[PDB]
Design a protein around this ligand. Structure first.
Ligand code: CA
Ligand code: CA
Ligand code: CA
Ligand code: CA
Ligand code: CA
Ligand code: CA
Ligand code: CA
Ligand code: CA
Ligand code: CA
Lengths: 369, 369, 123
């Protein structure tokens, strides 16, 4: 392959087969999307008019009243909290994140206090919020959520993620009901979610997505929800949002990435994966098969099982040599203890499949057995 | 002209003749720079290796030990303060911006407390800093700077800007001497500055630039300085810097924009401006002449003076109709009270000069006199 | 200001000050608004004397104007300021002196200071 730009700077060529991981650059933007960004970058625009129009265009995909584009989902969380605390008041916006003497408590489940590389507490604290944790890490009841609300509460936060505790937690419906009964905004963190309308439709006031993670967009994120609260988010441009800046180029890039996602994307069919699966199985000690997501639909992956006796290496040794090689090959390390590594083709580009098989055989030949 | 992407979204075509203004998108990235960004966006990379290499490449232009790329200059200020307060300690990084019980005072001149669309206080406060203002708005002595230092002081901040009070303030040398005498880091805000080496060479520990403003780069900024303090800046990726994210694409874009700036750029010569100046003077009531910067070198601009009696409109009426027209034309509004507006050709692209002259005549014809 | 018992509340930045910033600084602890006319002050980007008069009269608070070097005796009183301060030596080549001029109700409160802090500022 012709060397990528990172190879030209002295870095390794990376093959992504794990997923949208922040340690590898999150996502690969489509070339059609980068064209729209470059044309936007090479021209001036009235930013105030761009903010409204991009919010209007993004809202067409989410079904909310208005939308606001941010630099990332973490910035969306900080802005959404600041919106709930300041109500858009220009004086309070300049004070953030020193919310002294204001209603600044953000109520969330303890099971949702998650670390995605950085603690979700940091994003909330940047917006001026003070975290109030509800329930235990394994169980949370509704009366615990209702008792946590008092005159200092500024917002409720619901976090949707596989990082969160999956059982024993309250439903999104419980948060909506408690929030509207106390006349408080409900904020939803759906950073990796691809469902654009489901979280807004549930009655949440502000929902936060990450444009890079889910929709393979240039570095971006957006808040979508009620126009009154989105307006309070926009007011943060004179405050904390000035440090979380996204330019006109990536604002446009997100919009075209949403349209590129809405038009549809041709996912890799199972028929295409089988030739790659057969080649890996030919290697001594490696057995490869195509597997749909055991708990998910419309996702095909190549599961590879390693026999230490035949190959001479365990699955941990294979995965490490895949990354450590001259071409950094990142596979899924979930079931590595069980002797299995898997390949997610969604982040794999054309031809990259063949290179992974070549490295697998080279690792086998270097066993020398 | 073929409609730009913003025109396709329903927005006005903008002609920039004022300068790098945040209300118009700051800057126009060079097409060669956008190519490097698109290739970077369409590929994965080990971010940890990219952070070091980009810091090394940026440091070649500034002469500092190391460098760190940020989303904007405001993010660089927040990170630099957090670096001075946390010293890179992972526990303190997670606490920001709640720097309770730490040395968190940032000492700066009151004459440097400026508003660039957002108060510089907001960026400092996001990093955990508490502002300590030195001197008055018109005068600041050295003993005032030395008396402000105590065991709670975390850093000294020097702000370079035309927004700052120009006379009566302390020199950069005074800040360096006081900072090193108390063993405290000196932070310099040089967001719009094009001098990459002068501020680092003066002995400042961390200097902050804006990649978009000065070097016509995609949305970016960087901190450059001593490796020990830059290391404390990098440590903020697990804390407040997670919300001020810049992706791999604009990280590369800044590096290629610095090389595109270092190779040199062909500035518009005075000979090229004269045809445009002559056409404007042909209009009744308008007198146009080329003028070098009265206080600056190597900057040519087209100063246009309006005669209300002849034209029928004052300079304020002309400037407003330039912006309000179907093509938004932004001129310099500094001496508009004196009956003069000027045209800065640095942000004007090829052919855009001719369109401005056409609108000027249309405004004159619509006088109907 | 501190000799008179005041605690300073600063509005805006050194280069820019908006009206909503001026109005937000007013609260139940506010005792007066102060406008300073001088070449020492920042010229561009600051609020006009009219903005201070309107905000002061909207909160029933006294507006104080420092016009020490000003030779305009009537212009600052005419704008509606409650107390305007001049320096007799600076502008009118007088022996060491100064004066406060303004509304009779507030000048009376100034005269009342002769039993207090004004005993140390004797003319
Ligand atoms: Ca509201
Ligand atoms: Ca749902
Ligand atoms: Ca072993
Ligand atoms: Ca080789
Ligand atoms: Ca250190
Ligand atoms: Ca210098
Ligand atoms: Ca008129
Ligand atoms: Ca027409
Ligand atoms: Ca007057």
């Amino acid at each position: 392959m012709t060397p990528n730009i990172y190879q030209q700077l002295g870095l390794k060529k990376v093959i992504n087969a794990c997923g949208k991981m922040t340690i590898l650059g999150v996502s690969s933007v489509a070339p059609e999307v980068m064209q729209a960004t470059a044309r936007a970058a090479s021209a001036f625009v009235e930013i105030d008019a761009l903010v409204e129009k991009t919010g209007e265009l993004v809202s067409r995909y989410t079904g909310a009243e208005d939308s606001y584009i941010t630099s990332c989902a973490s910035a969306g969380i900080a802005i959404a909290v600041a919106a709930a605390i300041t109500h858009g008041d220009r004086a309070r916006v300049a004070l953030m994140p020193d919310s002294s003497g204001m209603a600044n408590e953000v109520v969330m489940l303890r099971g949702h206090n998650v670390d995605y590389g950085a603690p979700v507490t940091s994003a909330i604290r940047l917006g001026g919020g003070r975290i109030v944790e509800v329930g235990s890490s394994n169980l949370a009841t509704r009366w615990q959520l209702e008792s946590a609300i008092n005159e200092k509460t500024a917002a409720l936060l619901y976090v949707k993620s596989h990082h969160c505790v999956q059982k024993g937690m309250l439903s999104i419906d419980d948060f909506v009901q408690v929030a509207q009964a106390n006349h408080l905004p409900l904020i939803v963190d759906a950073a990796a979610e691809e469902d654009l309308r489901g979280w807004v439709a549930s009655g949440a006031d502000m929902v936060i997505y990450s444009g890079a993670k889910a929709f393979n967009a240039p570095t971006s994120g957006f808040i979508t929800g009620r126009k009154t609260w989105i307006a309070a988010c926009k007011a943060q441009h004179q405050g904390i949002a000035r440090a979380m800046k996204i330019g006109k180029e990536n604002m446009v890039g997100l919009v075209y990435a949403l349209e590129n996602y809405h038009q549809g994307q041709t996912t890799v069919t199972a028929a295409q994966l089988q030739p790659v699966a057969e080649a890996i199985s030919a290697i001594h000690g490696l057995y490869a098969d195509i597997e749909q997501d055991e708990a998910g639909r419309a996702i095909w992956r190549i599961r590879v099982r390693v026999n230490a006796s035949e190959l001479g290496l365990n699955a941990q040794d294979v995965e490490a040599q895949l990354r450590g090689g001259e071409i950094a090959i990142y596979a899924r390390k979930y079931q590595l203890h069980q002797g299995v590594f898997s390949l997610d083709p969604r982040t794999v580009a054309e031809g990259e499949m063949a290179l992974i098989v070549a490295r697998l055989r080279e690792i086998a030949e270097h066993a020398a057995d």
